[PDB]
mmCIF file of C-alpha atoms in Angstrom:
data_model
loop_
_atom_site.group_PDB
_atom_site.id
_atom_site.type_symbol
_atom_site.label_atom_id
_atom_site.label_comp_id
_atom_site.label_asym_id
_atom_site.label_seq_id
_atom_site.Cartn_x
_atom_site.Cartn_y
_atom_site.Cartn_z
ATOM 1 C CA UNK A 1 0.000 0.000 0.000
ATOM 2 C CA UNK A 2 3.124 1.901 -0.472
ATOM 3 C CA UNK A 3 1.742 3.026 -3.843
ATOM 4 C CA UNK A 4 1.970 5.943 -6.209
ATOM 5 C CA UNK A 5 -0.406 8.698 -5.133
ATOM 6 C CA UNK A 6 -0.341 7.834 -1.415
ATOM 7 C CA UNK A 7 0.100 10.488 1.293
ATOM 8 C CA UNK A 8 1.622 10.138 4.745
ATOM 9 C CA UNK A 9 1.471 12.505 7.737
ATOM 10 C CA UNK A 10 3.828 12.491 10.722
ATOM 11 C CA UNK A 11 3.579 13.496 14.358
ATOM 12 C CA UNK A 12 4.365 17.144 13.475
ATOM 13 C CA UNK A 13 1.649 17.321 10.828
ATOM 14 C CA UNK A 14 4.197 17.248 7.989
ATOM 15 C CA UNK A 15 3.141 15.353 4.896
ATOM 16 C CA UNK A 16 4.871 13.282 2.233
ATOM 17 C CA UNK A 17 2.826 13.312 -0.965
ATOM 18 C CA UNK A 18 4.064 10.422 -3.145
ATOM 19 C CA UNK A 19 3.423 11.280 -6.795
ATOM 20 C CA UNK A 20 4.945 8.436 -8.829
ATOM 21 C CA UNK A 21 6.638 5.105 -8.250
ATOM 22 C CA UNK A 22 7.924 3.770 -11.569
ATOM 23 C CA UNK A 23 8.463 0.174 -12.695
ATOM 24 C CA UNK A 24 11.908 0.130 -11.043
ATOM 25 C CA UNK A 25 10.597 1.581 -7.759
ATOM 26 C CA UNK A 26 12.009 5.047 -8.278
ATOM 27 C CA UNK A 27 9.935 7.574 -6.332
ATOM 28 C CA UNK A 28 8.937 11.183 -6.952
ATOM 29 C CA UNK A 29 6.818 13.404 -4.707
ATOM 30 C CA UNK A 30 6.547 16.524 -2.637
ATOM 31 C CA UNK A 31 6.938 17.211 1.056
ATOM 32 C CA UNK A 32 5.346 19.941 3.165
ATOM 33 C CA UNK A 33 6.968 20.552 6.527
ATOM 34 C CA UNK A 34 4.675 21.714 9.332
ATOM 35 C CA UNK A 35 6.993 21.072 12.295
ATOM 36 C CA UNK A 36 7.020 23.876 14.861
ATOM 37 C CA UNK A 37 10.525 25.124 15.473
ATOM 38 C CA UNK A 38 11.709 24.374 11.947
ATOM 39 C CA UNK A 39 11.834 26.776 9.008
ATOM 40 C CA UNK A 40 10.787 25.922 5.434
ATOM 41 C CA UNK A 41 7.163 25.343 6.502
ATOM 42 C CA UNK A 42 3.952 25.299 4.483
ATOM 43 C CA UNK A 43 5.433 25.128 0.993
ATOM 44 C CA UNK A 44 6.182 22.137 -1.245
ATOM 45 C CA UNK A 45 9.674 20.659 -1.558
ATOM 46 C CA UNK A 46 10.470 18.111 -4.296
ATOM 47 C CA UNK A 47 11.262 14.582 -3.154
ATOM 48 C CA UNK A 48 13.054 11.683 -4.811
ATOM 49 C CA UNK A 49 13.865 8.176 -3.542
ATOM 50 C CA UNK A 50 13.217 4.475 -3.882
ATOM 51 C CA UNK A 51 10.738 1.818 -2.847
ATOM 52 C CA UNK A 52 11.698 -1.856 -2.513
ATOM 53 C CA UNK A 53 8.714 -3.858 -1.302
ATOM 54 C CA UNK A 54 8.057 -2.339 2.089
ATOM 55 C CA UNK A 55 11.432 -0.545 2.299
ATOM 56 C CA UNK A 56 11.491 3.110 1.318
ATOM 57 C CA UNK A 57 13.951 5.957 1.159
ATOM 58 C CA UNK A 58 13.085 9.497 0.308
ATOM 59 C CA UNK A 59 15.031 12.726 0.341
ATOM 60 C CA UNK A 60 14.380 16.400 -0.047
ATOM 61 C CA UNK A 61 16.597 19.401 -0.658
ATOM 62 C CA UNK A 62 15.332 22.336 1.408
ATOM 63 C CA UNK A 63 15.312 24.817 -1.452
ATOM 64 C CA UNK A 64 12.260 25.944 -3.371
ATOM 65 C CA UNK A 65 10.853 29.081 -4.943
ATOM 66 C CA UNK A 66 9.965 30.635 -1.589
ATOM 67 C CA UNK A 67 12.447 29.518 1.041
ATOM 68 C CA UNK A 68 15.857 27.924 1.655
ATOM 69 C CA UNK A 69 17.060 26.081 4.717
ATOM 70 C CA UNK A 70 20.493 25.319 3.162
ATOM 71 C CA UNK A 71 20.295 21.586 3.871
ATOM 72 C CA UNK A 72 19.015 18.163 2.779
ATOM 73 C CA UNK A 73 17.024 15.583 4.725
ATOM 74 C CA UNK A 74 16.992 11.883 3.948
ATOM 75 C CA UNK A 75 14.557 9.387 5.439
ATOM 76 C CA UNK A 76 15.046 5.633 5.514
ATOM 77 C CA UNK A 77 12.143 3.526 6.577
ATOM 78 C CA UNK A 78 9.598 0.847 6.106
ATOM 79 C CA UNK A 79 5.903 0.398 5.539
ATOM 80 C CA UNK A 80 3.898 -1.497 8.136
ATOM 81 C CA UNK A 81 0.231 -2.446 8.188
ATOM 82 C CA UNK A 82 -1.256 -2.437 11.676
ATOM 83 C CA UNK A 83 -4.943 -2.407 12.606
ATOM 84 C CA UNK A 84 -5.822 -2.233 8.931
ATOM 85 C CA UNK A 85 -3.958 1.045 8.514
ATOM 86 C CA UNK A 86 -0.667 1.750 6.754
ATOM 87 C CA UNK A 87 2.210 3.554 8.464
ATOM 88 C CA UNK A 88 5.765 4.387 7.411
ATOM 89 C CA UNK A 89 8.302 4.284 10.233
ATOM 90 C CA UNK A 90 11.540 6.157 9.483
ATOM 91 C CA UNK A 91 14.874 7.391 10.714
ATOM 92 C CA UNK A 92 16.128 10.594 9.122
ATOM 93 C CA UNK A 93 19.448 12.374 8.684
ATOM 94 C CA UNK A 94 19.786 16.086 8.009
ATOM 95 C CA UNK A 95 23.020 17.428 6.466
ATOM 96 C CA UNK A 96 23.647 21.167 6.305
ATOM 97 C CA UNK A 97 25.546 22.927 3.519
ATOM 98 C CA UNK A 98 29.040 23.905 4.711
ATOM 99 C CA UNK A 99 29.391 21.061 7.200
ATOM 100 C CA UNK A 100 32.897 19.845 8.127
ATOM 101 C CA UNK A 101 32.282 16.954 10.570
ATOM 102 C CA UNK A 102 29.900 13.916 10.644
ATOM 103 C CA UNK A 103 29.036 15.132 14.162
ATOM 104 C CA UNK A 104 27.090 17.971 12.492
ATOM 105 C CA UNK A 105 24.660 15.629 10.728
ATOM 106 C CA UNK A 106 21.407 15.709 12.694
ATOM 107 C CA UNK A 107 19.379 12.513 13.261
ATOM 108 C CA UNK A 108 15.812 11.919 14.288
ATOM 109 C CA UNK A 109 12.796 9.718 13.928
ATOM 110 C CA UNK A 110 9.484 10.317 12.132
ATOM 111 C CA UNK A 111 6.496 7.980 11.976
ATOM 112 C CA UNK A 112 3.861 8.634 9.327
ATOM 113 C CA UNK A 113 0.224 7.530 9.092
ATOM 114 C CA UNK A 114 -1.695 7.245 5.845
ATOM 115 C CA UNK A 115 -3.884 10.262 5.117
ATOM 116 C CA UNK A 116 -6.293 11.771 2.579
ATOM 117 C CA UNK A 117 -8.745 14.672 2.464
ATOM 118 C CA UNK B 1 30.973 18.481 -6.290
ATOM 119 C CA UNK B 2 30.306 18.391 -10.029
ATOM 120 C CA UNK B 3 28.528 16.355 -12.675
ATOM 121 C CA UNK B 4 30.690 13.616 -14.200
ATOM 122 C CA UNK B 5 32.753 13.186 -11.028
ATOM 123 C CA UNK B 6 33.680 9.822 -9.450
ATOM 124 C CA UNK B 7 34.333 9.077 -5.813
ATOM 125 C CA UNK B 8 35.816 5.938 -4.283
ATOM 126 C CA UNK B 9 35.309 4.964 -0.636
ATOM 127 C CA UNK B 10 37.602 3.272 1.911
ATOM 128 C CA UNK B 11 36.332 -0.147 0.807
ATOM 129 C CA UNK B 12 36.837 0.448 -2.911
ATOM 130 C CA UNK B 13 33.207 1.141 -3.880
ATOM 131 C CA UNK B 14 32.612 3.932 -6.420
ATOM 132 C CA UNK B 15 29.929 6.592 -6.770
ATOM 133 C CA UNK B 16 29.765 7.744 -10.381
ATOM 134 C CA UNK B 17 27.899 11.049 -10.482
ATOM 135 C CA UNK B 18 26.368 11.491 -13.928
ATOM 136 C CA UNK B 19 24.253 14.662 -13.726
ATOM 137 C CA UNK B 20 23.597 17.468 -11.300
ATOM 138 C CA UNK B 21 20.799 19.582 -12.762
ATOM 139 C CA UNK B 22 20.012 23.252 -12.267
ATOM 140 C CA UNK B 23 18.101 22.437 -9.066
ATOM 141 C CA UNK B 24 20.901 20.204 -7.775
ATOM 142 C CA UNK B 25 19.056 16.968 -8.428
ATOM 143 C CA UNK B 26 21.558 14.165 -8.885
ATOM 144 C CA UNK B 27 21.644 11.145 -11.117
ATOM 145 C CA UNK B 28 24.397 8.463 -11.185
ATOM 146 C CA UNK B 29 25.474 4.877 -10.654
ATOM 147 C CA UNK B 30 27.129 2.990 -7.828
ATOM 148 C CA UNK B 31 29.397 -0.048 -7.894
ATOM 149 C CA UNK B 32 29.854 -1.825 -4.574
ATOM 150 C CA UNK B 33 33.208 -3.511 -3.935
ATOM 151 C CA UNK B 34 33.006 -3.899 -0.156
ATOM 152 C CA UNK B 35 33.765 -7.428 1.038
ATOM 153 C CA UNK B 36 28.148 -6.970 1.177
ATOM 154 C CA UNK B 37 26.649 -8.820 -1.790
ATOM 155 C CA UNK B 38 25.602 -6.939 -4.954
ATOM 156 C CA UNK B 39 29.270 -6.399 -5.908
ATOM 157 C CA UNK B 40 30.766 -5.387 -9.259
ATOM 158 C CA UNK B 41 27.607 -4.330 -11.067
ATOM 159 C CA UNK B 42 26.035 -0.903 -11.496
ATOM 160 C CA UNK B 43 23.096 0.254 -9.353
ATOM 161 C CA UNK B 44 21.237 3.499 -10.223
ATOM 162 C CA UNK B 45 21.546 6.422 -7.829
ATOM 163 C CA UNK B 46 19.447 9.504 -7.213
ATOM 164 C CA UNK B 47 19.866 12.329 -4.702
ATOM 165 C CA UNK B 48 20.514 16.059 -4.145
ATOM 166 C CA UNK B 49 23.376 18.438 -3.884
ATOM 167 C CA UNK B 50 23.153 21.715 -2.023
ATOM 168 C CA UNK B 51 26.496 23.568 -2.051
ATOM 169 C CA UNK B 52 28.795 21.113 -0.291
ATOM 170 C CA UNK B 53 25.942 19.011 1.192
ATOM 171 C CA UNK B 54 24.935 15.885 -0.678
ATOM 172 C CA UNK B 55 22.504 12.999 -0.320
ATOM 173 C CA UNK B 56 22.388 9.979 -2.547
ATOM 174 C CA UNK B 57 20.475 6.731 -2.448
ATOM 175 C CA UNK B 58 20.487 3.432 -4.261
ATOM 176 C CA UNK B 59 18.047 0.548 -4.480
ATOM 177 C CA UNK B 60 19.931 -2.759 -4.460
ATOM 178 C CA UNK B 61 18.131 -4.299 -7.422
ATOM 179 C CA UNK B 62 19.457 -4.485 -10.960
ATOM 180 C CA UNK B 63 19.388 -6.931 -13.870
ATOM 181 C CA UNK B 64 21.961 -9.282 -12.254
ATOM 182 C CA UNK B 65 21.472 -9.269 -8.454
ATOM 183 C CA UNK B 66 19.182 -8.195 -5.617
ATOM 184 C CA UNK B 67 20.077 -7.412 -2.029
ATOM 185 C CA UNK B 68 16.433 -6.656 -1.030
ATOM 186 C CA UNK B 69 17.373 -3.296 0.493
ATOM 187 C CA UNK B 70 18.073 0.426 -0.028
ATOM 188 C CA UNK B 71 21.058 2.469 1.121
ATOM 189 C CA UNK B 72 20.971 6.225 1.665
ATOM 190 C CA UNK B 73 24.012 8.389 2.262
ATOM 191 C CA UNK B 74 24.080 11.893 3.753
ATOM 192 C CA UNK B 75 27.345 13.787 3.581
ATOM 193 C CA UNK B 76 29.424 16.790 2.741
ATOM 194 C CA UNK B 77 32.309 17.737 0.480
ATOM 195 C CA UNK B 78 35.668 18.697 1.992
ATOM 196 C CA UNK B 79 38.996 19.264 0.225
ATOM 197 C CA UNK B 80 41.852 18.531 2.607
ATOM 198 C CA UNK B 81 45.415 17.458 1.872
ATOM 199 C CA UNK B 82 44.936 18.333 -1.799
ATOM 200 C CA UNK B 83 42.140 15.877 -2.491
ATOM 201 C CA UNK B 84 38.357 16.261 -2.596
ATOM 202 C CA UNK B 85 36.387 13.932 -0.299
ATOM 203 C CA UNK B 86 32.716 13.300 0.493
ATOM 204 C CA UNK B 87 32.317 12.334 4.158
ATOM 205 C CA UNK B 88 29.068 10.448 4.713
ATOM 206 C CA UNK B 89 26.843 8.637 7.159
ATOM 207 C CA UNK B 90 24.669 5.929 5.585
ATOM 208 C CA UNK B 91 21.523 4.017 6.537
ATOM 209 C CA UNK B 92 20.503 0.692 5.055
ATOM 210 C CA UNK B 93 16.866 -0.455 5.225
ATOM 211 C CA UNK B 94 15.890 -4.012 4.351
ATOM 212 C CA UNK B 95 12.571 -4.902 2.698
ATOM 213 C CA UNK B 96 10.258 -6.517 5.269
ATOM 214 C CA UNK B 97 11.687 -4.664 8.299
ATOM 215 C CA UNK B 98 9.416 -4.032 11.289
ATOM 216 C CA UNK B 99 11.563 -2.022 13.706
ATOM 217 C CA UNK B 100 13.891 0.987 13.308
ATOM 218 C CA UNK B 101 16.534 -1.044 15.176
ATOM 219 C CA UNK B 102 16.839 -3.168 11.999
ATOM 220 C CA UNK B 103 18.090 -0.203 9.953
ATOM 221 C CA UNK B 104 21.870 -0.586 9.632
ATOM 222 C CA UNK B 105 24.134 2.441 9.933
ATOM 223 C CA UNK B 106 27.736 3.237 9.031
ATOM 224 C CA UNK B 107 30.197 5.841 7.773
ATOM 225 C CA UNK B 108 31.865 6.022 4.344
ATOM 226 C CA UNK B 109 34.476 8.514 3.182
ATOM 227 C CA UNK B 110 34.715 8.813 -0.617
ATOM 228 C CA UNK B 111 37.829 10.224 -2.310
ATOM 229 C CA UNK B 112 37.932 11.836 -5.760
ATOM 230 C CA UNK B 113 39.131 9.594 -8.582
#
């Protein structure tokens, strides 16, 4: 149920909108960040990545036509079905332009639930 | 970091960056030579470059071999001691995983070639 045209919302209210997943599993989409305390909110950021069965990676560069956060986030995760409901559970890494040490790469965890209007 | 640049890590694996478009979206191929399966054949790569920051990811499935997983690298370009390097942290997620503890993590440093 990791499919093209599926949307996923995390604990901050941020949403991954998956647009396409091609025959090879290559992913395109958009992400809208709504996490308090972060910048680059409320506008769409292009996403690319891969799907392999239930495994998924997706990444976004925080630059678009309205706002830059000078960095890139990459999520690695997996789809799970629980209670008859799909979720994607992820770990992310955030690398900032101009970094000089691996210690500067930020890590965190996001869990996403399936969503639609 | 430029299009048509190649980078070899401490284990002998190579990232071949093919394109970096006007938005910094990256296209390329990866050949694994780390004494991990899926060795010696090309795997497509996608990702992003933002200044000296870079992410790239590969799905371990091609026409010759599957490793049922995806690796994603996050890293940054540095030029020290006269050679360009990309210093990265990677995460590897296996198809069928059910806990974040199953995602494997490591560090790779890639040198220009």
